[PDB]
Amino acid sequence: SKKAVWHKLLSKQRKRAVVACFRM
Amino acid sequence: LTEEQIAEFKEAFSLFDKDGDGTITTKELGTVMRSLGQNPTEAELQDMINEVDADGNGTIDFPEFLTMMARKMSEEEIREAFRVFDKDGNGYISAAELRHVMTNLGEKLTDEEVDEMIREADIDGDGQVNYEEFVQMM
Ligand SMILES: [Ca+2]
Ligand SMILES: [Ca+2]
Ligand SMILES: [Ca+2]
Ligand SMILES: [Ca+2]
């Protein structure tokens, strides 16, 4: 089952997008 | 400012709030930034917190986070995420696009892992993940 990998990517992408917000 | 949107921002906040105490500190922001491969100086951290820290107590609470995130109005976070995966914008996530995201987020990959990931998500059997399949997987 690879749902955990999809969810790990989603979590990292969301953290990355919030950091970008902090950078702006 | 709907209740649905506030919940999504709460989930985002909890990705930063490592101790769960309802505040984001410079140390917590720095921890997340380092896990993504960035190394901000302690002064850049303080300046990012400061641009958001409305009350000046040095940490970000959820209402302050909500103000920052509200200002930008972008689409729902899940649609935003799909666009990161579907770099060419044709509405489908390919194996090459998934490899790109995994590489950019520092996740090791093999071809068989990537094929199995698409296969699990791919309800209509067309070899790619469309938006509806992505939302159901996420
Ligand atoms: Ca905290
Ligand atoms: Ca504050
Ligand atoms: Ca695509
Ligand atoms: Ca499909």
The domain in which residue B30 lies consists of 3-71
**B129 bridge partner residues:** B93
Binding-site annotation, residues of B for Ca(2+): 17, 19, 21, 23, 28, 53, 55, 57, 59, 64, 86, 88, 90, 92, 97, 122, 124, 126, 128, 133
Domain CATH number, residue B40? 1.10.238.10
The rounded Cα B80 to chain-centroid distance in angstroms is 9
**Whether the Cβ atoms of residue B121 and residue B134 lie closer than 8 Å to each other:** yes
Q: Experimental method for this entry? A: X-ray
Give the pair of three-digit tokens for residue B27. 């140390």
Helical H segments across chain B, by residue range: 3-14, 26-35, 42-52, 62-71, 77-85, 95-104, 111-121, 131-137
| Ligand with minimal distance to B61 CA | 2
**Whether the Cβ atoms of residue A6 and residue B138 lie closer than 8 Å to each other:** yes
Q: How many CA atoms lie within 13 A of B44 on its CB side?
A: 11
Resolution for this experimental structure (Å): 1.8
Whole-angstrom distance, CA of residue B46 vs CA of residue B5: 27
* Ramachandran quadrant class, B22 (left: phi over 0; alpha: psi -120 to 50; beta: rest): left
Measured from the Cβ of residue B62, the count of other Cβ atoms closer than 10 Å reads 16
